[PDB]
């Protein structure tokens, strides 16, 4: 994360300064339309972020959840596994 | 003033590359501006300049110009539409044995020139093997490339992309010869034959483990005098997969080329010259002409 979104910020940073000696080196409609592209895909991304911010409240639970899942699933493993265990016995055992 | 920008080709961690056209020859070039403390011109740029100013081969990129302004510079190379990485990764276009032979021949000819000039391209990978619409492969970037002749010079062991690193560099060899380029060339050929990175390592130890479990750990009769490298650690004795099992559809001559390029002993490893003299390149499927090589369209 953080490093991602900040080197992200860089990409705006440098991107922009690129565009910015291209402030002189572009056609005006392009200028506006892409600056808002960037800005907009941006703000969105920034929404993707602030969404991180705006639902990232959930950590300890949601992990604890996934944990709970895994706790469960292993019981059923244990279960069926104990069974196959038998079946091994069944064949191998018997036929010897 | 003399070059007009045409496209925003991209960036590397020390450069911004734009397609451009010169107003003097209407030839399409690639201009490379270098970014910017209290050190001056970046040493990777100076290394590009100094090494590429004294090389002129068909199969090495050549900087057609170099200039700059306050505290920053721009190089001007041949414009190269693609690299070998986009050719490898593109599932649409097939790489027949003739196409593979063409890429290998161009790579090894460029590298043979570079090695006869005692320069060592210490970063060789499909990303850094560009090629134009004429299908001429050129060794791309020399920002970490050196002169390997002098004894008095203490090199660095960390300089080549991990996946294409020779075992001795992972073991920390501060002094090495053309074996690093040739190991990276063998790895390029393996990735070219499998279309997926041969030996993709997560770390130096993982890269060594994968090298050894794929080829067998060297037994000190295959790589004698190995135990003396600064970062040598003993490994579990892996059997290694036979080469005619890794590359199940490569000819015997190609297998001999693979074996030569993948010898652990950095002195028994074949050089570009003697690689070029092997029966693989002289056998019946000729390399494809650069006009018939596949280009990844869009």
């Amino acid at each position: 994360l953080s490093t991602l979104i900040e080197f992200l910020l860089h990409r705006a940073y440098s991107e922009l300064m690129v565009l910015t000696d291209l402030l002189p080196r572009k056609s005006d409609v392009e200028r506006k339309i892409e600056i808002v592209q960037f800005a907009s895909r941006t703000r969105q991304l920034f929404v993707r972020l602030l969404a991180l911010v705006k639902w990232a409240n959930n950590a300890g639970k949601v992990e604890k959840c996934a944990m709970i899942s895994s706790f469960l699933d292993q019981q059923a493993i244990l279960f069926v596994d104990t069974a196959d265990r038998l079946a091994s016995l069944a064949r191998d055992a018997l036929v010897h | 003033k003399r070059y007009e920008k045409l496209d925003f080709l991209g960036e590397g961690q020390f450069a911004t590359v734009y397609k451009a056209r010169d107003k003097n020859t209407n030839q399409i070039v690639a201009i490379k501006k270098i970014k910017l403390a209290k050190d001056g011109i970046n040493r990777t740029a100076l290394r590009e300049i100094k090494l590429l100013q004294e090389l002129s081969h068909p199969n090495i990129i050549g900087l057609l110009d170099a200039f700059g302004h306050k505290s920053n510079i721009s190089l001007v190379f041949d414009f190269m539409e693609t690299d070998l990485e986009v050719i490898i990764k593109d599932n649409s276009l097939v790489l027949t044995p003739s196409h593979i032979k063409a890429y290998m021949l161009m790579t090894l000819q460029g590298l043979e020139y570079l090695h006869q000039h005692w320069i060592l391209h210490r970063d060789l990978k499909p990303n850094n093997l560009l090629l134009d619409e004429n299908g001429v492969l050129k060794l791309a970037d020399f920002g970490l490339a050196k002169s390997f002749g002098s004894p008095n010079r203490a090199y660095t062991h960390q300089v080549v992309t991990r996946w294409y690193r020779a075992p001795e560099l992972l073991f920390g060899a501060r002094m090495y010869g053309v074996g690093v380029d040739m190991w990276a060339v063998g790895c390029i050929l393996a990735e070219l034959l499998l279309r997926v990175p041969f030996l993709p390592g997560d770390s130096d130890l993982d890269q060594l483990t994968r090298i050894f479990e794929t080829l067998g750990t060297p037994t000190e009769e295959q790589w004698p005098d190995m135990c003396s490298l600064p970062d040598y650690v003993t490994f579990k004795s892996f059997p290694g997969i036979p080469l005619h099992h890794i590359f199940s559809a490569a000819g015997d001559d190609l297998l001999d080329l693979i074996q030569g390029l993948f010898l652990f002993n950095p002195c028994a490893r074949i050089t570009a010259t003697q690689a070029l003299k092997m029966k693989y390149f002289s056998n019946r499927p000729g390399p494809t002409p650069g006009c018939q090589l596949p280009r990844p369209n869009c």
């Binding site: 994360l1 005006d28 907009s40 941006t42 639902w55 950590a59 | -």
Partner: protein
């Protein structure tokens, strides 16, 4: 925490909204208000630094990579808990169904066991007294 979270908010929130500003004016270039525009850029620089200050102490927090994908698919987390919740159903099904498999299994078991000799007699001490 929250009010550093909430700082990342109203500030960095303000940073998104400021962007709303940025675009909305930058549709239309008045030859100078780039002064206003680039003062927003100025806002962008005072931000970006202050942010990163708000960002290297942001912890890059450990990556729920997939549930990331899930909110990288914008599908908000709650459905996660929800969906593993639906599994948790299926799993509570399995587990307690199996207990039932038992409770009959034993039950009908002992049933026939009695309908068969219920005569693991002495050791039925433990058996009965095991029920």
């Amino acid at each position: 925490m929250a009010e550093k979270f909430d700082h990342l908010e109203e500030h960095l929130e303000k940073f998104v909204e400021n962007i709303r500003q940025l675009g909305i004016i930058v549709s239309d270039f008045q030859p100078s208000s780039q002064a206003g525009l680039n003062q927003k850029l100025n806002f962008i620089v005072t931000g970006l630094q202050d942010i990163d200050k708000c960002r290297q102490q942001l912890h890059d927090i450990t990556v729920p990579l997939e549930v990331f994908e899930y909110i990288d698919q914008g599908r908000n987390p709650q459905l996660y808990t929800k969906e593993c919740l639906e599994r948790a159903l299926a799993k509570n099904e399995q587990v307690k169904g199996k207990i039932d498999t038992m409770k009959k299994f034993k039950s009908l078991l002992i049933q026939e066991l009695s309908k068969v000799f219920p005569e693991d007699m002495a050791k039925y001490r433990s058996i009965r007294g095991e029920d």
